[PDB]
């Protein structure tokens, strides 16, 4: 009762959306190093027994369609859900290859009332993306 | 008996609200590097929020940006754990 039940037959899905190359119209830089991240995450969540699905260079429409489709799967036999987003971003926003989409639009597909087979189960979103343009100068220890 | 529709979500953000997030072209992003290292070391020993706290410490202490542009040089990063979870999460 203090810990989530994690002994369902499957740990669950790990969806990794790895956006490296962006349309000219966005003005966004290519994200050198993100393939290292995606491979590292694939191996890490493999060792945790997640069903990893790597997607690369998705438009915002393809991101939304993927999340909608994943949320329509039967997660009854799965303990949890993990989604990793690797892209450019702003506060509350993740970039498809062709432009921004609100993070809330992505996570709303998994709300307790809209993905019933994940109700009561942990839904983890791991977000590597900027949240604005502030820089942290740090302080000497 | 109902629960909030926003319950049981966890958002592990690479950086604090309003801030840039840093990535190295050869090693990967500071956050994902550190997250994968801590999951490998501790996923059979620590509850997930304590793993993410170790990620916070690793990103905060082991990374500092390098730039020819003084505007972007010697900068730091703290990740941001946002938990609406209602129970402890153990991967074992």
């Amino acid at each position: 009762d203090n810990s989530y039940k994690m002994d369902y037959p499957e740990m669950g899905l790990c969806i990794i959306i790895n956006n490296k190359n962006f349309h000219k119209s966005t003005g966004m830089t290519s994200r050198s190093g993100t393939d290292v991240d995606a491979a590292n995450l694939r191996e890490t969540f493999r060792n945790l027994k997640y069903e990893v699905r790597n997607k690369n260079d998705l438009t915002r429409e393809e991101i939304v369609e993927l999340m909608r489709d994943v949320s329509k799967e039967d997660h009854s036999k799965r303990s949890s859900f993990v989604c990793v987003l690797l892209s450019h971003g702003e506060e509350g926003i993740i970039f498809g290859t062709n432009g921004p989409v609100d993070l809330k639009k992505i996570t709303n597909f998994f709300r307790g009332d809209r993905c019933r087979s994940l109700t009561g189960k942990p839904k983890l979103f791991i977000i590597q993306a900027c949240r604005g343009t502030e820089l942290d100068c740090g302080i000497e220890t | 008996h109902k629960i909030p529709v926003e319950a049981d979500f966890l958002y592990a953000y690479s950086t604090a609200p309003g801030y840039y997030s840093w990535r190295n072209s050869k090693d990967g992003s500071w956050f994902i590097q550190s997250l994968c290292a801590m999951l490998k070391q501790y996923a059979d020993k620590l509850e997930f929020m304590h793993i993410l706290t170790r990620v916070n410490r690793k990103v905060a202490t082991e990374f500092e940006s390098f730039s020819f542009d003084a505007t972007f040089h010697a900068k730091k990063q703290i990740p941001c754990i946002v938990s609406m979870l209602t129970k402890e999460l153990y991967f074992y």
Binding site: A129, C130 | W22, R23
Partner: peptide
């Protein structure tokens, strides 16, 4: 090299 997202 270090770059921002």
């Amino acid at each position: 090299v270090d770059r921002v997202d």
